[PDB]
Symmetry: C3
Subunit: 248 residues, 3 copies
Amino acid sequence: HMPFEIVFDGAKEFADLIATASNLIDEAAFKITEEGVSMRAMDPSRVVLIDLNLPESIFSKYEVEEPETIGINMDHFKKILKRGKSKDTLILRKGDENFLEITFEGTAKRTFRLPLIDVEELELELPELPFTAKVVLLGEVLKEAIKDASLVSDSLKFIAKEDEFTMKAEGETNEVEIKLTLEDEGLLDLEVEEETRSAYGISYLADMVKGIGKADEVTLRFGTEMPLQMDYFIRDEGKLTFLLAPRV
Amino acid sequence: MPFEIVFDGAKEFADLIATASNLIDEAAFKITEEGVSMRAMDPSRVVLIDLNLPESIFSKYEVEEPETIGINMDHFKKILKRGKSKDTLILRKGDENFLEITFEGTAKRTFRLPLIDVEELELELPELPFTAKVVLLGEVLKEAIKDASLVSDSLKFIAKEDEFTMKAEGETNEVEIKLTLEDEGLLDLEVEEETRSAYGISYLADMVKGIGKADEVTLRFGTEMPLQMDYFIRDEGKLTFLLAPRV
Amino acid sequence: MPFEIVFDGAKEFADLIATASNLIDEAAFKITEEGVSMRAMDPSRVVLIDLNLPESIFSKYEVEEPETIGINMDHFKKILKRGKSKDTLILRKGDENFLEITFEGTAKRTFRLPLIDVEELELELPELPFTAKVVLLGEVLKEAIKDASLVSDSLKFIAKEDEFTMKAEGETNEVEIKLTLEDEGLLDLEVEEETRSAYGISYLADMVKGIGKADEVTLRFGTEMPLQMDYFIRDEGKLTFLLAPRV
């Protein structure tokens, strides 16, 4: 565990990224190499897989001597990261000691000391899955549909056809459909190999999109009775990815 | 029995229904060729509400045959709360027995709302001998009710020739809200005789919860008489509360 | 008739009373012709609090009868939270035992807040040998108190000739806020010798709750001495907390 210094401009954007990921997980092992920071984790129900990739190109300073792996209490990390202001600089620094030093530089110099726990890593791989449908769309639409489907049901059907993406949720007698064509604003891109249907639990969906903003582009990939893969991009270089198991 | 009604400004429409459903729970909407109307009482039969929306405030108004539909107001409120200020609202009914609510904006979002049948009542609004008419900004009204709640649970209205007063007194505390024509918040006053009545704050509070700050509100009342309070939606639709006085 | 005081900007006045009520329950106001003054302790007898409002901050200040009134701060605060930022606040004491509070804006609103008899103790705001003085933005100050609240119950303050340093430590975790004259949030630093003290966060939490981020706070303290926190009210008035230290 050699020392490193990592620096990020915009402490608030970082917090909101960490907060999204932390919605599902509680402890995570961050891999720090000379190429970037990568975190890969499942939530306790072993239904969501989170994968964070922050290449070194999104950091204003990235001094990493030797590749190591630190364990972080995600909720404690978030309580601290939430004190960052939008124009603050975030500095994550480790010395010889077994804690993390999180510093905010702006109107003052605020320094926290975050104790480094140990996390047991699972053999977690991001496999190449045969997704038959791909969908880029505004977070605004996505956040909307999960909130609207929550009014009716616990699960949300996704239905992708050559020219229309559709979410649908059926309750005791109440029903909601959201429908999107390339003629719509919310829909940026739609690639369907074959007509594709699948369903996913709103509870998990609500937590994955909770930290996404109305303005962001989200990519969806999914297949008939296959995982849902949702990802968006951080400073157009970092990537946050969720893999979500279906309802069967 | 199909129809199609289109309203530009989904969020405005919600604010309207949300004002109505503060006191109502279930309503029959009368859909005719001239507009949509609804007349409901609250559970304690203290308040009559009367919503009229002429065809001229809808962008598209296609009604084949006049009809009446009953709506669970609370469910309808929940769905209407999902519209954005720039969405277009579409109220469509096919030959089936539910209500298609649709928001066209960044996406097409469609809800099916089951209809219900509603105990309708000998609901008529006779003209009553009001001796006082006040017109005032909504924020003056919302203020004086929120202020009065701190002291009492009744609000006394008192009109003389050139002063309008709301007064609320408790055991030791007391608040008074005086309005004269010189004040920006009063837009009009007409009093034929000195008028005094009192009304409950619980009901009043709920009547104005959904009223904008800069809305023009009209109050008509009379000594130991009901309080008629109305204000306009888009200058052509009208919302009326009739409120029973206190002893 | 015994006095009439007028203050343009009711919400500004409210926010000031609201600051000094986070610690105080009852208080005696000394109304002289020079201005209004107020000096109270919190129930712990740990924070001394002292408010002074020179008559030059009031648009109208007529005092016939210099006297002293007693006020239930929570009741006063409930009323004062009803003034709008464009309201004119009026305080009238007539012959009787109540304080008439008026908001003049879009309407005339009047409250009668009943006065009370407060066991006014003898409170001297003494002079103390402070060795460190710091001026800084509320934003910094409120953050440090929130930050430090995630770790500990006390907050060390540490002034050296060049840097000001708040520091809170628990069993495992640590926060540390450091300010030099090169930082935008420090505006004045005057240190006579190296100074260190400690204070309860819970009390610091309430003293700053009502302070705006744009505000300018003056800290004076010395080793194991009270903490003196000033912030000014329209440049003429002064609010002053005095905070017994933690050992």
